[PDB]
Design a protein around this nucleic acid. Structure first.
Lengths: 245, 174
RNA sequence: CAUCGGUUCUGGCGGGGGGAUAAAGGCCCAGGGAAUGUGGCUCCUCCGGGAGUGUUAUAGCCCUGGGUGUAAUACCCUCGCCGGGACCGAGGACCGCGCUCUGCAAGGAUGCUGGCGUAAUGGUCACCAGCGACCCGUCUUGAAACACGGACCAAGGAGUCAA
RNA sequence: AGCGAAUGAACUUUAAAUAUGUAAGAAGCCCUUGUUACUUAACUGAACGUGGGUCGAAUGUAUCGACACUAGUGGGCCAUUUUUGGUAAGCAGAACUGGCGAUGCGGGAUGAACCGAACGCGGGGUUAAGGUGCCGGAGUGGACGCUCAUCAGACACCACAAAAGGCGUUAGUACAUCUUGACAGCAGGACGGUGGCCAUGGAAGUCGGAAUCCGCUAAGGACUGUGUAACAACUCACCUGCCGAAUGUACUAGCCCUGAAAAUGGAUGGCGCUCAAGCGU
RNA sequence: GGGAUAACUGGCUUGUGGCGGCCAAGCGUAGCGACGUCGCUUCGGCUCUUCCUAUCAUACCGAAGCAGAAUUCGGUAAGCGUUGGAUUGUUCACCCACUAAUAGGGAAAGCUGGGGACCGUCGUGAGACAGGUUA
RNA sequence: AACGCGACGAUACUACCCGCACGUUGUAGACGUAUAAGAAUAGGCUCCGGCCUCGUAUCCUAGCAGGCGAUUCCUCCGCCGGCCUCGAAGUGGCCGUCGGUAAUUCGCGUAUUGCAAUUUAGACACGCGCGGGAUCAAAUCCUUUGCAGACGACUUAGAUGUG
């Protein structure tokens, strides 16, 4: 009845997809399956996955699918009867959480070499364990947070004070400069964002991003792949210790 | 409303020279007595068909009694009532023991919730839901739940209205 | 107080009839079916209990037909029989209609008994109490309202006579 | 109603509701032949005569009619229904019927116009309208629901008043999303051509004008807001993971709030009443 | 000269114009149609008591480039107050100031200044009368 | 509050208090006029065993309107005192004396009010009588005062004195 919140009708250009995109996702995968010799299943567990675009450019001869796990599982067929090619249903066993498909025409050992030498530094994201303690120096806070030396750094933008203060930094504007205590840096101690070996939440993770401090690592973990010629799915290092569907 | 029984009313147009053996229409009518049952037959017929009381004849009036007045049943009633805006369709569910009990509850419920009167309500269909999963309304659905058992908190005792003065303060627990 | 008559209010009891010769129901007989699935079995299980399978087993239920069966009961309509109150007693030889006839509850109350026989019943005043209740007349008007007359009492005071 | 009958309110086989005029016997209808100054071509018609045949629906009937004589009366007000005309709204006029006038009594707290019911003096019984929380005689009666009002409501339902405002509450209708994971949330993505073109001191999605395409896509607007001198940065749209079963929108019908009020202190009749002593059956 | 008529208003009144087109949920199966937008523009003074709020001031709040000061718009509020002169030149009658401010009304009322109607006669292209009567 | 209440002082007669004797005295109305937890109602009580819809419960309840004498019983009721306790518009407890007293069972008496007629019966207040104790007062008029005043009213002073 009455006493309900008002749903906002956004004045926007892009609407929600719904059923049409799902069916489009099925068609794209099903037509891709006959064209490639191997189907790789890879895992990105708790990563930000903004670097997956660079992976697509490097692997331009391959096709990468990163959609809904359930939609991708039944597109490949989760039972022997609705399966598309031999051994595909046991590939769908690997599709459990945040995973993706990699169709390739390459040597399987070549893919392992590429994704094992690939390593990029990224931001933390909540749930990760802090490898090092980050502390902002007491005084004029800079745009890095005591990581780049202050002589080579610039002061942080003044429009970030309400955002920093909301996350819990006791800062203030002193003559247009954000300051922790006093500009001389004597009034108060520093601020400890994250401690050693402690799970960090989104509050601490957000503080790290505005300071451009990277604490996590981006890496793609291959779980297993499927050979079109043999119709046989093999097991790769990552998969033996990971929950199955 | 009142006390009702189902009535099987069969009536016909008076046989003329041109049209012997007329159509012999039939309706089921909920009425307090047989006098009202025949009146509703001709009022409904005057709307639907072109047969009037003067050129009409009541063939039979019979009482339909419920086959199992000891089995708890769920009933679904499709009715139309007219209001200041117009005529509206509504479907409602009643958990009762007889159809007459279900229809009597409907008249009370429509009067309480929409101020609808007997002259305003047309009963289009009353049906026994032959099985659960045919119950759509949540208030009936909760009564057909598995292992239903509830307490009766804050039960006011029945004291004679002529017993003005009581020595002890009453209790509302049993 | 007892026995009656007229009127009336209010309890109980014994029968008859009618529905679908009620519908249901209890106990039997023969089928079919399902779950808010009883046992049994399997998996979770924290004393506890859940999830799944399947058709009566260590519970039951639904639907159809038959028997007991012209069953009982409710409702409607009917024929009577007892009980408890209230108000009333008009008339005054016989006659009548009648019946249950040595008579009678049949064209209207008699019988038995007690206290008192005097302010006791009853009546008149004044007052209290409960309920009720505009101040008369005239005039106008469809009607009110307005307006006019009214300090009080006694006596007098107005459709008569003649043609 | 039909036009699978014809034709096309002005069509019809048939036919509503509704009032409404006339008639229903021996105080009657037809025939007949005698006359007549009427009439006809004519004993032919018409009038005047003769004879012939369960008394010709129901219900009521406390009598009907004729003549003569005698007294008081010459208005109207309101309401229903029908109808004519008009206004922003009022309203004005006709026809019938009913109430009041000459009418007491019961009820609506009160009362010209409402409901019940009409009258000698008394006793008993039963009711109508209206009522049964106390004033106050009779129920703090029974069943199912609805409603909380910062002067609710208790029968005025006309006006204020609208296609009106309510993140009050209940019932319902239609459409739509959902174990292919719907609504809400949290953790992340929100990218590339590209500071798109013009303009501007400066203008990079976000002071302005106009176009508004493609790639990667799971998805991401030549961008919804915050922000900068311009960037940067944040946010929204949209997508994914976790979570897990029901949700969303728009209407309809009830009851409740607002939907405008001045001025001595006062009114559902009063107290007062909230699973009512309010509202519907 | 005649006819109908004593006369009006009483949940009245208040802040947002009318007309025409476009749009328009519905009603309906052409017509009515709101909000918006476009087009054209007798009177004055005197008063005392009380009440109302539709608040001028004083109290408290919300908002505004509201720096301070001074304000402006709005809300709750009637507890408390709401002046002294001119009216001697002109007009839509309204200037001088003082003050915190110099708000508007109801009880609708009395003093004080400003500023009749009927016939009769003689005539009517038109009035006259010290002619008569009267609430 | 001139028809709301409290505390205190002095109260002459009348009768102020106490005891009992009655009233042809008044009572919006005796007839067992019997009964103290507090608090919650989506909780509570207890004896700590248990108990709670239910005051249709508990107490009291027999005798010439309630006699006399026993048998038998320490149970209940009442009056007085002593010690205390009760103040919101003021009482009850404990102890002691005395009086009455079916828990059981008898004997004597009831009649005649004549077949019902309020079973005149309680409490408070008021009044009339005795016999015991107790007390010996004020206000107003008047004169005066001016703290007051239309008149009343008011503040004063008049008995030996700071008149």
């Amino acid at each position: 009845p009455k006493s309900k919140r008002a749903r906002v009708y956004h004045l926007i250009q892009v609407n929600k997809k719904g059923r049409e995109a799902k069916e489009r996702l099925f068609s794209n995968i099903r037509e891709t399956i006959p064209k490639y010799q191997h189907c790789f299943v890879f895992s990105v567990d708790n990563m930000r996955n903004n670097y997956l675009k660079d992976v697509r450019h490097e692997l331009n001869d391959c096709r990468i699918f990163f959609g809904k796990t359930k939609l991708m599982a039944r597109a490949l067929g989760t039972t022997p009867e609705e399966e598309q090619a031999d051994g595909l249903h046991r590939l769908t066993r690997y599709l459990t959480g945040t995973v993706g498909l990699l169709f390739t025409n390459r040597d399987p050992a070549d893919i392992e070499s590429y994704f094992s030498n690939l390593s990029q530094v990224d931001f933390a994201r909540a749930g990760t364990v802090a490898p090092r303690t980050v502390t902002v120096p007491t005084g004029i806070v800079y745009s890095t947070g005591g990581e780049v030396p202050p002589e080579h750094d610039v002061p942080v933008s003044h429009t970030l004070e309400p955002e920093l203060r909301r996350l819990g930094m006791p800062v203030r504007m002193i003559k247009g400069k954000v300051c922790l205590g006093d500009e001389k840096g004597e009034a108060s101690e520093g601020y400890t964002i994250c401690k050693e070996g402690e799970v960090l939440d989104s509050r601490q993770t957000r503080l790290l991003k505005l300071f451009s401090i990277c604490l996590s690592e981006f890496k793609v973990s291959l779980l297993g792949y499927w050979n079109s010629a043999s119709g046989e799915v093999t097991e790769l290092e990552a998969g033996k210790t990971r929950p199955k569907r | 409303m009142g006390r009702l029984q189902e009535y099987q009313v069969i009536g016909r147009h008076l046989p003329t020279e041109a049209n012997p053996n007329p159509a012999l229409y039939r309706m089921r009518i909920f009425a307090p007595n047989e006098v009202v049952a025949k009146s509703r037959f001709w009022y409904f017929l005057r709307g639907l068909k072109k047969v009037k009381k003067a050129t009409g004849e009541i063939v039979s009036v019979n009482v339909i009694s419920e086959k199992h007045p000891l089995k708890v049943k769920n009933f679904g009633i499709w009715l139309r009532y007219d209001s200041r805006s117009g005529t509206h369709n509504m479907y409602k569910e009643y958990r009762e023991t007889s159809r007459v009990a279900a229809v009597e509850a409907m008249y009370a419920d429509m009067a309480a919730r929409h101020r609808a009167r007997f002259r305003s309500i047309h009963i289009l269909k009353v049906v026994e839901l032959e099985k659960t999963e045919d119950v759509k309304r949540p208030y009936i659905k909760q009564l057909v739940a598995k292992n239903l058992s509830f307490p009766l908190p804050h039960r006011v005792p029945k004291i004679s209205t002529k017993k003005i003065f009581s020595a002890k303060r009453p209790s509302t627990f049993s």
